[PDB]
Structures are given as structure tokens and as C-alpha cells.
Scaffold this motif. Structure first.
Motif, PDB file in Angstrom:
ATOM      1  N   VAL A   1       0.836  -1.193   0.000  1.00  0.00           N
ATOM      2  CA  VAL A   1       0.000   0.000   0.000  1.00  0.00           C
ATOM      3  C   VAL A   1       0.876   1.251   0.000  1.00  0.00           C
ATOM      4  O   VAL A   1       1.790   1.385   0.815  1.00  0.00           O
ATOM      5  CB  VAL A   1      -0.973  -0.004   1.198  1.00  0.00           C
ATOM      6  CG1 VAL A   1      -0.233  -0.311   2.495  1.00  0.00           C
ATOM      7  CG2 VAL A   1      -1.707   1.325   1.292  1.00  0.00           C
ATOM      8  N   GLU A   2       0.596   2.164  -0.926  1.00  0.00           N
ATOM      9  CA  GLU A   2       1.421   3.342  -1.132  1.00  0.00           C
ATOM     10  C   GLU A   2       0.558   4.595  -1.075  1.00  0.00           C
ATOM     11  O   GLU A   2      -0.639   4.562  -1.375  1.00  0.00           O
ATOM     12  CB  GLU A   2       2.161   3.268  -2.473  1.00  0.00           C
ATOM     13  CG  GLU A   2       3.426   4.101  -2.543  1.00  0.00           C
ATOM     14  CD  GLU A   2       4.283   3.748  -3.741  1.00  0.00           C
ATOM     15  OE1 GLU A   2       3.903   2.821  -4.490  1.00  0.00           O
ATOM     16  OE2 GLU A   2       5.334   4.392  -3.936  1.00  0.00           O
ATOM     17  N   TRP A   3       1.184   5.703  -0.688  1.00  0.00           N
ATOM     18  CA  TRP A   3       0.499   6.976  -0.521  1.00  0.00           C
ATOM     19  C   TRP A   3       1.258   8.065  -1.265  1.00  0.00           C
ATOM     20  O   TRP A   3       2.471   7.971  -1.466  1.00  0.00           O
ATOM     21  CB  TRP A   3       0.369   7.345   0.964  1.00  0.00           C
ATOM     22  CG  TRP A   3      -0.262   6.266   1.780  1.00  0.00           C
ATOM     23  CD1 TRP A   3       0.364   5.200   2.359  1.00  0.00           C
ATOM     24  CD2 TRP A   3      -1.650   6.140   2.102  1.00  0.00           C
ATOM     25  NE1 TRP A   3      -0.549   4.419   3.024  1.00  0.00           N
ATOM     26  CE2 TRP A   3      -1.794   4.976   2.882  1.00  0.00           C
ATOM     27  CE3 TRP A   3      -2.787   6.901   1.809  1.00  0.00           C
ATOM     28  CZ2 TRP A   3      -3.028   4.554   3.371  1.00  0.00           C
ATOM     29  CZ3 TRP A   3      -4.009   6.481   2.295  1.00  0.00           C
ATOM     30  CH2 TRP A   3      -4.121   5.318   3.068  1.00  0.00           C
ATOM     31  N   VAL A   4       0.527   9.102  -1.681  1.00  0.00           N
ATOM     32  CA  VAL A   4       1.097  10.222  -2.418  1.00  0.00           C
ATOM     33  C   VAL A   4       0.470  11.518  -1.921  1.00  0.00           C
ATOM     34  O   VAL A   4      -0.491  11.520  -1.149  1.00  0.00           O
ATOM     35  CB  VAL A   4       0.891  10.097  -3.945  1.00  0.00           C
ATOM     36  CG1 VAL A   4       1.528   8.825  -4.484  1.00  0.00           C
ATOM     37  CG2 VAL A   4      -0.592  10.157  -4.292  1.00  0.00           C
ATOM     38  N   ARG A   5       1.040  12.631  -2.381  1.00  0.00           N
ATOM     39  CA  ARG A   5       0.433  13.943  -2.195  1.00  0.00           C
ATOM     40  C   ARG A   5      -1.000  13.946  -2.700  1.00  0.00           C
ATOM     41  O   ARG A   5      -1.280  13.482  -3.808  1.00  0.00           O
ATOM     42  CB  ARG A   5       1.233  15.004  -2.958  1.00  0.00           C
ATOM     43  CG  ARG A   5       2.572  15.371  -2.365  1.00  0.00           C
ATOM     44  CD  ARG A   5       2.462  16.623  -1.514  1.00  0.00           C
ATOM     45  NE  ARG A   5       3.473  16.619  -0.468  1.00  0.00           N
ATOM     46  CZ  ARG A   5       3.385  15.871   0.623  1.00  0.00           C
ATOM     47  NH1 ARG A   5       2.330  15.085   0.784  1.00  0.00           N
ATOM     48  NH2 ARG A   5       4.340  15.903   1.542  1.00  0.00           N
ATOM     49  N   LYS A   6      -1.913  14.479  -1.889  1.00  0.00           N
ATOM     50  CA  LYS A   6      -3.184  14.910  -2.456  1.00  0.00           C
ATOM     51  C   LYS A   6      -2.968  16.127  -3.343  1.00  0.00           C
ATOM     52  O   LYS A   6      -3.326  16.118  -4.525  1.00  0.00           O
ATOM     53  CB  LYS A   6      -4.202  15.210  -1.357  1.00  0.00           C
ATOM     54  CG  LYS A   6      -5.435  15.930  -1.884  1.00  0.00           C
ATOM     55  CD  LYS A   6      -6.708  15.477  -1.197  1.00  0.00           C
ATOM     56  CE  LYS A   6      -7.923  16.158  -1.815  1.00  0.00           C
ATOM     57  NZ  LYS A   6      -9.201  15.688  -1.214  1.00  0.00           N
ATOM     58  N   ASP A   8      -2.914  19.110  -5.649  1.00  0.00           N
ATOM     59  CA  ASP A   8      -3.967  19.664  -6.489  1.00  0.00           C
ATOM     60  C   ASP A   8      -4.808  18.592  -7.175  1.00  0.00           C
ATOM     61  O   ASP A   8      -5.536  18.906  -8.123  1.00  0.00           O
ATOM     62  CB  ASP A   8      -3.363  20.600  -7.539  1.00  0.00           C
ATOM     63  CG  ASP A   8      -2.207  19.966  -8.292  1.00  0.00           C
ATOM     64  OD1 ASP A   8      -1.182  19.641  -7.653  1.00  0.00           O
ATOM     65  OD2 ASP A   8      -2.326  19.780  -9.522  1.00  0.00           O
ATOM     66  N   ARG A   9      -4.730  17.344  -6.723  1.00  0.00           N
ATOM     67  CA  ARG A   9      -5.464  16.250  -7.341  1.00  0.00           C
ATOM     68  C   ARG A   9      -6.647  15.842  -6.471  1.00  0.00           C
ATOM     69  O   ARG A   9      -6.763  16.229  -5.304  1.00  0.00           O
ATOM     70  CB  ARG A   9      -4.540  15.051  -7.593  1.00  0.00           C
ATOM     71  CG  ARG A   9      -4.530  14.014  -6.479  1.00  0.00           C
ATOM     72  CD  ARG A   9      -3.485  12.947  -6.742  1.00  0.00           C
ATOM     73  NE  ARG A   9      -2.143  13.404  -6.400  1.00  0.00           N
ATOM     74  CZ  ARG A   9      -1.028  12.896  -6.914  1.00  0.00           C
ATOM     75  NH1 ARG A   9      -1.096  11.922  -7.811  1.00  0.00           N
ATOM     76  NH2 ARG A   9       0.154  13.369  -6.540  1.00  0.00           N
ATOM     77  N   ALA A  10      -7.538  15.053  -7.064  1.00  0.00           N
ATOM     78  CA  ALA A  10      -8.695  14.508  -6.373  1.00  0.00           C
ATOM     79  C   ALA A  10      -8.399  13.097  -5.877  1.00  0.00           C
ATOM     80  O   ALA A  10      -7.498  12.412  -6.369  1.00  0.00           O
ATOM     81  CB  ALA A  10      -9.923  14.501  -7.288  1.00  0.00           C
ATOM     82  N   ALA A  11      -9.189  12.663  -4.894  1.00  0.00           N
ATOM     83  CA  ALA A  11      -8.928  11.410  -4.190  1.00  0.00           C
ATOM     84  C   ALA A  11      -9.605  10.215  -4.857  1.00  0.00           C
ATOM     85  O   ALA A  11      -8.933   9.265  -5.271  1.00  0.00           O
ATOM     86  CB  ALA A  11      -9.380  11.532  -2.732  1.00  0.00           C
ATOM     87  N   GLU A 176     -10.374  13.392 -11.971  1.00  0.00           N
ATOM     88  CA  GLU A 176      -9.635  12.672 -10.937  1.00  0.00           C
ATOM     89  C   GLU A 176      -8.298  13.336 -10.629  1.00  0.00           C
ATOM     90  O   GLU A 176      -7.859  13.344  -9.472  1.00  0.00           O
ATOM     91  CB  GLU A 176      -9.440  11.214 -11.355  1.00  0.00           C
ATOM     92  CG  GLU A 176     -10.731  10.406 -11.330  1.00  0.00           C
ATOM     93  CD  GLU A 176     -10.557   8.981 -11.821  1.00  0.00           C
ATOM     94  OE1 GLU A 176      -9.429   8.609 -12.207  1.00  0.00           O
ATOM     95  OE2 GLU A 176     -11.554   8.228 -11.821  1.00  0.00           O
ATOM     96  N   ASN A 177      -7.638  13.902 -11.637  1.00  0.00           N
ATOM     97  CA  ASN A 177      -6.319  14.496 -11.457  1.00  0.00           C
ATOM     98  C   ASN A 177      -6.372  15.951 -11.008  1.00  0.00           C
ATOM     99  O   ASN A 177      -5.319  16.584 -10.879  1.00  0.00           O
ATOM    100  CB  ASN A 177      -5.515  14.388 -12.756  1.00  0.00           C
ATOM    101  CG  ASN A 177      -4.027  14.581 -12.540  1.00  0.00           C
ATOM    102  OD1 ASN A 177      -3.436  13.987 -11.636  1.00  0.00           O
ATOM    103  ND2 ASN A 177      -3.412  15.423 -13.366  1.00  0.00           N
TER     104      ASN A 177
END
Lengths: 389, 389
Positions: A1-6, A8-11, A176-177
Motif C-alpha cells: 500500500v502506497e500513498w502520495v500527495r493529495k 492539487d489532485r482529487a482522491a 480525478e487528477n
């Protein structure tokens, strides 16, 4: 499981938040169209051709088609009624004065269902095969509606009948982006570039004059819904384009001085029947669905025989194509906006009949369209529970 | 700072991984073009007209332009040169036989610089204002290059000269929202729709006959580069589209039976100077840059006067717009492919001259293109250290 910056993008995945349709007021019953068609095109002397067009129009199962072209308009622009006469400038002046306005009727009602102010619209995707304009109808619609001048527009000219799926595929990545993005999707189609008179030497092209029609569909697409004020209708899970094998020159259209002349030398239904099971099996692979009748269907009814062949090939219940067959009957073939008319019809039907989901009680759904390529756009849909509405 | 599950999206900003250009072999020196233009159109008796065209061609600061149209081709398609005959069909046949092929030449070279197999290309973005085809040049390019039949294509027809920025804006969202996605961006442009005889034009169109030319550009865009195999050249930080106030009908291109007839009834150089500072200050807002000469520049050179006006307005060094002027002198206005040409020249120049970054030593950069609307595309670029190359 990996995570990134929210950032300016949508979840979450992109959702359909609103849907509305619109048509010109003028329409013709398919039973009356042959006599109207050969009169306005100055062809009442082509008796056998008139009788053949009568039998073609009956087999289409179409009942009503809205068209911007009236008997008055064709009189002031007689070159459009000819089979092949220089008329692109005339056809394009009608496209400029109708296509953006028709999309406005659908957008206004779709924004009305949305309930949010128009200044929240960040993106606009506009599809039309009824006129190449510079600036395009995306600019005219943006000005007619009063949208933000800094809106990010995407004008799609003359993609063909599959551009309905192309619009959803595009809207998916835009919503989404980009966090907070709200995507107005408009497909304003008309027979302006296709309508022409009958030809005693090109009888193959009478079939196109018996199916195409006018209509606009508008959607609001976005991720991360505000459930206090917004109501998702569907989720756009996946959307993929595909070129089918051995399909060279299957659907060809040349933009001539007399508009578009569609070239149809390859059997499209045989082509779809050979490939639709494999394409839908790849789209449904992540869902785990293993019955065709446990999903809801949206198929582009460009050729009516495909609906019957697909139904018999996959052994579908006669009700699973009711919304597709309803739009084809009440509206005909509105190019790329047809599939979106079907989605709105499938939505309204599922709610009015008390179905558990907007997908007629089914969780997963497949939208299938096609056009020049032979190109196929496949969208995997996810319904929402109607109790949330 | 918020965080979201990555899932099947990409983590970082979209990067320009490789880029290449291509032009038709045939070219005309601008000092030879007036004599060629008026001879092949049989207009050498219009002496006052020809003298104006000489003074127009000398002011363009162009030394050569590549063009598909040769004297042999014009003689084999006399409709293109004949004022009394329609010609859209002959122009589209030339577009079908050159526009996809020209893009193939540019794309193959960009893929060679990229180094990865073609099967790793997931998306294609094709821009052209030189021929509406069904299926479009995006299909043709896909067949010629041997790309995957399941590629996600996005055909942009007849958007005008700003489509260079539009394609970068589209590729950014395609790459960033799809992990592992690699987007081939191709803009193949030509004068096949605007070329005509001089007496067939107004004043404004005669200047277009001195600037327009043919050429194709091809990029590889993608997020999360495999630094073991790939080398980013630039980063797409932000990309916006804007309609300028009081710019109704500033640039109009009507597609007719004689080709694309342009109209420029407003002062486009004055429109840009009125709004360029405000538009670029918003794009540079998150960068902290304070001085105009601390970034690199890619300005569309469709109006050479805009270059000299923007130079004096923002008080730029004569060295700042060097890359933009090299393409204008060497290639003329190649529609949407011009700004991408300038980006490649800026890269090659900065690398060969030993600059610290691919932005000629600077970190941030702006790309600015314009077309019908009046529409303005604006891309914020981030350079990379040349030591990584």
C-alpha cells in the motif's frame, strides 16, 4: 500500500453528478419521413427509390426523429437537399447558429439538476460531428452559458459515433487528477453535415438518411462529491479505446464540399459480434461478474441489427436493452450523444420503477459505442443505491 | 497536507521524456518565395500586389519554410490554385497522404531518443488543423507506427495555432492520473487548407501566405520516470486556458469549399500585450520568480511583431527569445507545432552551449500559445540539470 500527495489532485473515482438531454422542437414521424424526404429533395419522380426508402425506414424501428432542418430551411438552402452540391458554408452557418444553442438547452437542465453555481465548472468537453468551427462550439457554449473565461476546454470535432465514450474517458482523467474539478460534458450532434438527397446510384447511403437525427446530452462529471449538496449517479471505473482487427476502411467519412459522405463497405455487425464478447470480458474482469444478465447495458444503436445480434449472442433478457431500444425508437441515431440519452433513460427508468440502484438494480454496467476505426470505446460503470437520492 | 492512496495513479508531475521534429524535404527560401508564389499561381502581371508581398515577406524575418506543396503537386491539383473551382477534396487527399506520415517521421525519432518499446505507449494525442479525416490522423499514425490497438487516442481537429499548448495540457492529466502511462504527443501541421492564390485573399490573408509552413513535432510525456532508463527534459507544472476579454471574433477560420479562409479583424499584437503580464504573473505565482529575465521563454511566433513588443514590454534581454526567433527564421509559422519546435530548439541549444539547465540555465519557464477565441494557452515549465544528460 502506497500513498502520495493529495496536492492539487482529487482522491476518489470520477462520478456522474448530473445528466440532461435536449432536442430541437421540430421532429418527423418515421412513417411520414419518406414522403417528406423525397418532396423536399425534389425527388418525387424516383418512385422505386421512394418505395425502397419506405421499406428501409420501417426496418429501422425508429418512430420519431428531431431535426433542425425544416421544410423552410431546406428551401432557403437548396444545396443541402441535393445529393452532392457545394454547401459546407451553408451547413456550417446552421451549425454555428444551432449546435452551441442546443448544447445550452442540455447544459442548463443538467446544471439545474446539479444544483451548484456555474462558476464551479472548471472543465468543458464538447463533441460534435455536425460542423467544424474556429473557434469551435466549445467557445460559443462557454460564452452563451456565461462560464468562466479561464475554463479549460477540450473541443472534439468529427470523431464519429463513438465520441460519447471518448467524452467519458476524457472526463474521468480531468476530474480525478484535479481536486475540486467539475467537468461539463456536452455532446451536441446533428445531421447537418450528413443530410443530403437520394441518389439512384448511391442507394447504400439511403440507410444513413433513415437513422441519423439531432439531439444534445450534457453531463456533470467530478470526483470527491460533496454529499451534503451533490448526488452521484454513476462511477466511471474504467474507459478504454480499441481498434478492432481486420477493420481497415470499415467506416470512412470524407469532409467534401457537400459535407460528410460516410463510406460503409465492411459489415459492422459481423465485426462487432466477433469482438464484443472479448472486449466486454476484459472490461468486466476486475468486477468478478460472470453472468451477462447481472449487469446493465448501454450499447450505441447505430445499426439496429447489432442490438438483436448482441442479445442473441450473449443470451440477454429482453428487458436489459429496453432503454437502448427506447432512445433509438423515440430519437433515432444522434451520433455520439445517443449513448448518453440511453444512460439518462436507463437512470430515469430505474428510479421511476423502484429499482435498487440507478443501474436497474445491478451494481456494474458497461457502456459500448463504436465508429470510424473500426474504433470501440468501452466504459465500465458502477451504479449508486437509489436510496441515496 | 493531505494524503491519498496511490492505487493506479501516478505520484509525480508529468515530465517531457523525449521530443523530436520533422519537416517535408521541400523548402522555399523566403527571398525566392514571392517569385515562386506569383509564378505558379500565374499572377506575375499583378505588379503592385507582388511588390506588397515582397515588403510583407521581408518583414516576417523568415529565411525559409518547408512545404509539402511543390510546383509539380500544384499542377497535379489545379483546384487548389483555381479561384473558380472548389478544392476541399483535393486538399484532404493531400492531407491524408502527408499529415500522418509527417507525424510518423517525428514520432519515430522521439521514440528513438526515448529508448523504450512502442508497446509501452499507452496514450496518443494528435493535433492538426490541416485535414479533418474519418478515421483521423490519430488512427493513421497508430497504424503506421505499429502502436497497440488498445491505445487511448485523443484526436484534436482544427483547434488553431494554440493547440500546441492544448496538447501539453491534455498530456499532463493523462500521465499524472495513470501510473505507468506514457503519452505520445504529435502535432502535424501544414498549409494544405490555407494555401491559395494572392488575388484570392484579402490583406490579412496575404500575410498568412508569407508565414505559414509545414512541420511536425512529437513528444513523450510521462510521470514517475524510471531514472534507470529514462531522462526527463522538462516538467509540466501547470497548464491553463483562457479567453481574453473583448476578443469576440478576433481570429476566425471558416472551413468552406475553397479550404480554410481565415479572418483577423482585430489587433492581435495589441490584445496580447494588454494581457500577457497578468496571465504570466498568475502562472508564475507559485514559483516565487520576481524578474522576467530569470526564466526561459517559449512564445508562439505567429505574429513576429508580438515578439518585439513582448521583448520591450517585459524588458527582456535580446538573448531571451533566441530559441523562438531561430524557429521563426528557419521554419515559419507551423501552426500548433511551432511552440513545440521552439521547446526542442531551446533544449538542444541549452545542452550544446553548456548551460546548467535545459532551460538555458534557468529553472522555471513559461510556454505561451494563442489562437482563435481569442484563446490563450499557458504552460508552466520546470527545467532539469543538464548534468543528468
Amino acid at each position: 500500500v502506497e500513498w502520495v500527495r493529495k496536492a492539487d489532485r482529487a482522491a476518489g473515482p470520477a462520478a456522474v453528478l448530473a445528466m440532461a438531454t435536449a432536442n430541437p422542437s421540430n421532429f418527423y414521424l418515421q412513417s411520414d419521413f419518406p414522403d417528406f424526404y423525397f418532396r423536399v429533395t425534389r425527388s418525387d419522380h424516383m418512385s422505386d427509390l421512394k418505395e425502397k426508402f419506405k421499406r428501409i425506414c420501417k426496418k429501422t424501428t425508429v418512430r420519431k426523429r428531431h431535426m433542425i432542418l425544416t421544410e423552410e430551411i431546406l428551401n432557403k438552402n437548396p444545396a443541402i437537399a441535393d445529393y452532392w452540391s457545394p454547401s459546407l458554408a451553408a451547413r456550417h452557418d446552421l451549425a454555428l447558429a444551432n449546435i452551441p444553442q442546443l448544447g445550452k438547452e442540455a447544459a442548463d437542465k443538467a446544471i439545474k439538476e446539479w444544483g451548484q453555481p456555474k462558476s464551479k465548472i472548471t472543465h468543458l468537453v464538447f463533441c460534435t460531428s455536425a460542423g467544424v468551427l474556429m473557434p469551435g462550439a466549445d467557445y460559443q457554449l462557454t460564452m452563451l452559458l456565461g462560464l468562466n473565461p479561464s475554463i479549460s476546454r477540450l473541443m472534439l470535432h468529427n470523431l464519429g459515433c463513438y465520441a460519447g465514450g471518448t467524452a467519458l474517458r476524457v472526463a474521468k482523467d480531468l476530474a480525478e487528477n484535479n481536486g475540486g474539478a467539475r467537468v461539463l460534458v456536452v455532446c451536441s450532434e446533428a445531421n447537418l453535415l450528413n443530410f443530403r438527397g437520394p441518389s439512384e446510384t448511391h442507394i447504400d447511403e439511403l440507410i444513413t438518411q433513415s437513422l441519423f437525427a439531432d439531439g444534445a446530452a450534457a453531463l456533470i462529471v467530478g470526483s470527491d462529491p460533496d454529499l451534503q449538496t451533490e448526488s452521484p449517479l454513476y462511477e466511471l471505473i474504467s474507459a478504454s479505446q480499441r481498434i478492432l482487427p481486420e477493420s481497415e476502411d470499415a467506416i470512412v467519412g470524407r469532409l467534401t464540399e457537400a459535407g460528410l459522405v460516410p463510406y460503409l463497405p465492411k459489415d459492422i455487425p459481423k465485426l462487432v459480434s466477433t469482438n464484443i464478447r472479448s472486449i466486454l470480458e476484459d472490461a468486466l474482469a476486475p468486477t468478478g461478474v460472470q453472468d451477462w444478465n447481472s449487469i446493465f447495458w448501454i450499447i450505441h444503436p447505430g445499426m439496429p441489427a447489432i442490438l438483436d445480434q448482441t442479445e442473441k449472442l450473449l443470451q440477454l433478457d429482453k428487458e436489459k436493452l429496453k432503454a437502448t431500444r427506447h432512445v433509438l425508437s423515440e430519437f433515432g441515431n444522434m451520433f455520439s450523444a445517443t449513448v448518453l440519452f440511453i444512460l439518462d433513460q436507463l437512470r430515469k427508468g430505474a428510479v421511476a420503477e423502484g429499482k435498487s440502484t440507478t443501474g436497474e438494480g445491478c451494481e456494474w454496467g458497461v457502456l459500448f459505442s463504436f465508429g470510424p476505426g473500426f474504433t470501440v470505446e468501452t466504459v465500465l460503470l458502477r451504479s449508486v443505491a437509489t436510496a441515496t437520492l
